[PDB]
Write a protein that binds this ligand. Sequence first.
Ligand code: HEC
Length: 85
Amino acid sequence: ADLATGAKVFSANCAACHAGGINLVNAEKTLKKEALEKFGMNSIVAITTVVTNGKAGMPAFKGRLTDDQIAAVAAYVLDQAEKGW
Ligand code: HEC
């Protein structure tokens, strides 16, 4: 919502591990709505925090993405998950 920036950020930073509906190394490790919901991750604040910091080995993007870029990709992930990738 910046979805335009979000889509670009996703392509350049996230698709390498999450690309095209299902993740390359995963099944429910994709960004499907139901998977996000299990751990309360289906919100702008939750995705912003995990991408910035993130968690449990998932890489932190605080160095290489600005706060605005992270907010943008968070929007993109939520919108795509709602549409169904
Ligand atoms: C590999 C080196 C990754 C890159 C680059 C990105 N992510 Fe990731 N992510 C990765 C793994 C192994 C996992 C756990 C399994 C799974 O895929 O669910 C995740 C998880 C997420 C999640 C869910 C977090 C949760 O608490 O369950 C989100 C929302 C997520 N990943 C988003 C995301 C974005 C927006 C990225 C680019 C900025 C990104 N990931 C990069 C591995 C990797």
